[PDB]
């Protein structure tokens, strides 16, 4: 398919009518460009301010893997073990409300103005950290709210598939995993998942300073291309 459209600081109104109401993904430029975190977040800064804090870490290349597990460690431990010193295994600090834990970090980001278009309240917006090495994969899944994914460090390759295309995504039947596809997007078993081939999609390479809008229930897959650090805002 095609690329996600990029737009330089679209107005509330036009963001609302063109993307939010109809549920169309878009990359917003010029918005997160000047937030303090783009200039200062780096390994040394992360260690200095968060080094000693305990954090959940996912070990294993993909969360749908049989051998995937979850563990806890300090930030310094995570960086030395899964990022810096030739990691034996894949470690991802994922989906963690790090700003709740380290409130000094929260001044480096801002809640995007477009969040105010939803009929929910500011403080109920969930802000998650996503930090890991090159090569981390988040398998094809859907979320229950709107999402603003801001890229601070590195790049990410992302594939988006519409919620209307769900039939072709072969979601798990378990209930726990109903929001996760059974397909490995980048090397799909087309003998087992033949409908996946036809399903149209959008893709992009999200880069630092860019905000991707992922509409509620829109399926998304993410693979970090470099040492990456993203911030997601879930809102309604
Ligand atoms: C949480 N595991 C993560 N590495 N995969 C990407 C995110 C999937 C998560 N289930 C979500 O709601 O976005
Ligand atoms: Zn997600």
Numbering used by the authors: 181 to 416
Task: Provide the authors' own sentences about this structure as they appear in the paper.
Our recent discovery revealed that JMJD5 and JMJD7 specifically make first cleavage at methylarginine sites on histone tails through endopeptidase activities and continue to trim histone tails with aminopeptidase activities to generate “tailless nucleosomes”, which should be overcome by Pol II without further additional assistance, just as that of Archaea bacteria. During our pursuit in the characterization of potential histone arginine demethylases, we found that the catalytic cores of both JMJD5 and JMJD7 specifically cleave arginine methylated histone tails through both endopeptidase and exopeptidase activities. To address these questions, we have determined a series of structures of c-JMJD5, JMJD7, and c-JMJD5 with substrates, coupled with biochemical data. Comparison of c-JMJD5 and JMJD7 structures to those of metalloproteases revealed that both c-JMJD5 and JMJD7 contain basic elements required for hydrolysis, such as similar residues chelating divalent ions (His321, Asp323, and His400 in JMJD5) and rich negatively charged sidechains as proton acceptor (Asp323 and imidic-Gln275 in JMJD5) within the catalytic center of JMJD5.
To cross-confirm the authenticity, we also determined the complex structure of c-JMJD5 and monomethyl arginine, and to no surprise, the monomethyl arginine occupies the exact same position as that of dimethyl arginine, except missing a methyl group. The question here is whether c-JMJD5 or JMJD7 has different binding affinity depending on the methylation status of arginine. From the complex structure shown above, c-JMJD5 contains a binding pocket for methylarginine that is similar to those of Tudor domains. However, the hydrogen bond between NE atom of methylarginine and the sidechain of Ser318 could be critical for substrate discrimination.
